[PDB]
Amino acid sequence: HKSEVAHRFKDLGEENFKALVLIAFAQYLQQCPFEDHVKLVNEVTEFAKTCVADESAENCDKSLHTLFGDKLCTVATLRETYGEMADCCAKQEPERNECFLQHKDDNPNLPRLVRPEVDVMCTAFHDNEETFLKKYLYEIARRHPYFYAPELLFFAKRYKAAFTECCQAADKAACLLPKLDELRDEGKASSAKQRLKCASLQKFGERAFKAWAVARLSQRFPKAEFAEVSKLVTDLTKVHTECCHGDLLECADDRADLAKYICENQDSISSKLKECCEKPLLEKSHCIAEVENDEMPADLPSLAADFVESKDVCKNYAEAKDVFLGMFLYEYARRHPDYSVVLLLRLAKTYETTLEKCCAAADPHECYAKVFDEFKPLVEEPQNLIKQNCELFEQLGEYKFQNALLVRYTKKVPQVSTPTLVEVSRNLGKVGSKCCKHPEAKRMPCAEDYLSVVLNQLCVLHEKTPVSDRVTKCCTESLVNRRPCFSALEVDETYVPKEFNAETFTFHADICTLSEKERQIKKQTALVELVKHKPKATKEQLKAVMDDFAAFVEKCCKADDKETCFAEEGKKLVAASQAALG
Numbered sequence: 001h002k003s004e005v006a007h008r009f010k011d012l013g014e015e016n017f018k019a020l021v022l023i024a025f026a027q028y029l030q031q032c033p034f035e036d037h038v039k040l041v042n043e044v045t046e047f048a049k050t051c052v053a054d055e056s057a058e059n060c061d062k063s064l065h066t067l068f069g070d071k072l073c074t075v076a077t078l079r080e081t082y083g084e085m086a087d088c089c090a091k092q093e094p095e096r097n098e099c100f101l102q103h104k105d106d107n108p109n110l111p112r113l114v115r116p117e118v119d120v121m122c123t124a125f126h127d128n129e130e131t132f133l134k135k136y137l138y139e140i141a142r143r144h145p146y147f148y149a150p151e152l153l154f155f156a157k158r159y160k161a162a163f164t165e166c167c168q169a170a171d172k173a174a175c176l177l178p179k180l181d182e183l184r185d186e187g188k189a190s191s192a193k194q195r196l197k198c199a200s201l202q203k204f205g206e207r208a209f210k211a212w213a214v215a216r217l218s219q220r221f222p223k224a225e226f227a228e229v230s231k232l233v234t235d236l237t238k239v240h241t242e243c244c245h246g247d248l249l250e251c252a253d254d255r256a257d258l259a260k261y262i263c264e265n266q267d268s269i270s271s272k273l274k275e276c277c278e279k280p281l282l283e284k285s286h287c288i289a290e291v292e293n294d295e296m297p298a299d300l301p302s303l304a305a306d307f308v309e310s311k312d313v314c315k316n317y318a319e320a321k322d323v324f325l326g327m328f329l330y331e332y333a334r335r336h337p338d339y340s341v342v343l344l345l346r347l348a349k350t351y352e353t354t355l356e357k358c359c360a361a362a363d364p365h366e367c368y369a370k371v372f373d374e375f376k377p378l379v380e381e382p383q384n385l386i387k388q389n390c391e392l393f394e395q396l397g398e399y400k401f402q403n404a405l406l407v408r409y410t411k412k413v414p415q416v417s418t419p420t421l422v423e424v425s426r427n428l429g430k431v432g433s434k435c436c437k438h439p440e441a442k443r444m445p446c447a448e449d450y451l452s453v454v455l456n457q458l459c460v461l462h463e464k465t466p467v468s469d470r471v472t473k474c475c476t477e478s479l480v481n482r483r484p485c486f487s488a489l490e491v492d493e494t495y496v497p498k499e500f501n502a503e504t505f506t507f508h509a510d511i512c513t514l515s516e517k518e519r520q521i522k523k524q525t526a527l528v529e530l531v532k533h534k535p536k537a538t539k540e541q542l543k544a545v546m547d548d549f550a551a552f553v554e555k556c557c558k559a560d561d562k563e564t565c566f567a568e569e570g571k572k573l574v575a576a577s578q579a580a581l582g
């Protein structure tokens with residue numbers, strides 16, 4: 001109403017408010033100590049309560065941006081600590097807020113956050129749930145100044161849940177560690193995605209983004225009328241543009257407003273937005289974004305009717321090209337929740353090319369008449385890969401499957417770094433263990449989601465330390481040919497194998513006293529180095545060498561005087577092995 005702070009305070013709640021303000025400040029003032037942010041939070045909360053009691057108390061009428069910047073400019077060491085940022089305080093609103101946005105460092109030089117021992121965690125937890133959680137929430141926020149605050153808050157509650165449950169467990173570690181690893185991985189993925197999507201809106205442009213959304217929104221809301229989907233795609237695009245700019249307030253309101261729009265028109269959009277829409281303000285958006293696909297009508301026509309077998313098609317298309325293509329995507333995507341969004345884009349892209357080089361032809365109706373015939377090989381390629389790879393995954397285990405990938409990609413790009421190969425092959429290996437368990441009708445969307453993260457993660461490391469044109473090609477290609485481009489890569493014939501190095505293939509008993517997740521990376525590192533030394537090896541020659549190594553390990557660990565054993569059988573191993581691989 002007349003007071004913004006009061007309003008947000010009222011419908012967010014004290015607890016949520018206090019946490020958000022914390023994250024908000026930790027994101028702009030990434031260098032101040034924890035205890036300092038706590039003071040600000042208390043001061044702002046105290047102020048808020050004043051306004052709650054009387055929307056007319058001093059300053060309660062000022063806008064959040066104004067209020068936020070004023071307290072921000074309140075910090076004394078602003079200039080001595082942040083320098084340039086202090087000059088923002090000289091500017092007025094909105095240049096002031098704009099100025100603060102431009103000075104937020106997305107990759108501060110903060111030390112890697114370390115995970116202490118479960119016992120200390122659980123103890124610190126029990127002795128002060130409050131500071132324990134706010135302190136960590138502070139550490140995460142200052143490191144990811146662009147992570148959508150509410151989402152960060154969503155994660156905090158799951159961490160709390162993990163401590164509550166596990167710190168009472170008979171075996172704390174076995175209960176907590178896995179939940180924690182799962183949590184940071186998921187958090188990492190959530191972050192990689194947010195950055196990825198913004199980057200995209202930048203490179204590829206708005207049209208491609210609008211396309212992506214139509215495909216996605218249509219799979220999810222197959223019953224919605226096309227005009228509703230267009231309406232939603234427009235608002236969604238404005239929403240991400242603003243949320244990418246990094247301004248929390250504008251971002252949050254666009255998201256809420258959009259959630260309220262959806263919920264009000266719920267029936268004419270989806271039947272599965274029931275739970276999500278009764279939920280509280282804070283969670284609505286989160287919920288909705290994650291909602292399961294509604295069910296598609298059974299009384300659905302044939303695409304060929306309006307898109308192939310109907311003359312007056314080049315006329316509808318010329319009438320409004322993007323809109324017609326949109327209707328195509330809409331019609332195609334809502335009938336295929338099983339297709340990957342990018343697959344859908346490929347088809348539409350194909351259709352588009354056809355209509356372009358066929359509507360300017362003699363007899364249109366038959367120039368393009370067999371278009372749906374070109375979609376089949378587009379659809380099949382992805383499917384057969386999910387087919388071939390999920391089987392191999394079930395045969396071997398997650399680990400042996402990972403090793404397979406390891407050999408496979410080293411031979412494609414032997415120039416890539418050994419640790420980078422190990423990283424990629426394992427996450428990749430994960431996508432397999434995480435998606436292959438799904439029923440085929442859900443597999444492809446699964447892989448797309450995971451692979452996009454992995455492929456962009458792959459492309460960044462390379463962007464910085466480029467090592468191959470082939471990779472750089474796939475990495476700067478269209479995000480529709482990205483994965484196909486990588487899938488295409490062939491063995492590197494040009495490659496000149498690295499020289500030999502005894503050390504690289506020398507092992508000590510220490511590997512016996514390492515975690516399964518440790519020995520692995522050690523064995524896997526040697527594997528790449530192996531393939532990098534003998535690239536013309538065979539899955540047969542290789543499997544034989546890997547096998548002798550298998551024994552070698554167990555044999556030397558489960559044998560008296562480990563150290564010597566290794567150095568003894570090791571000389572033998574390296575010797576017999578170098579021989580087979582001539």
Ligand SMILES: O=C(CCCCC(=O)Nc1c(I)cc(I)c(C(=O)O)c1I)Nc1c(I)cc(I)c(C(=O)O)c1I
Binds near residue numbers: 201213217236258285
């Ligand atoms: O990341 C995603 C996940 C899409 C999930 C589909 C989606 O948009 N859901 C959704 C909905 I309904 C409503 C709201 I309110 C919100 C939100 O919280 O803002 C969201 I998140 N989508 C995506 C998009 I949209 C465009 C491009 I270009 C790319 C690329 O980088 O290829 C990608 I990977």
Ligand SMILES: CCCCCCCCCCCCCC(=O)O
Binds near residue numbers: 008068252281286
């Ligand atoms: C002075 C700064 C105060 C910070 C207030 C942030 C308000 C966030 C509103 C949260 C809306 C949740 C809607 C959603 O995105 O799902």
Ligand SMILES: CCCCCCCCCCCCCC(=O)O
Binds near residue numbers: 210
């Ligand atoms: C209703 C909003 C208009 C939707 C835009 C339709 C254009 C379809 C483009 C086909 C996909 C190719 C995307 C790309 O440029 O990479």
Ligand SMILES: CCCCCCCCCCCCCC(=O)O
Binds near residue numbers: 523
């Ligand atoms: C040319 C000397 C090569 C000898 C070094 C062999 C190292 C290969 C690592 C084998 C990893 C297989 C993993 C496993 O056994 O579970």
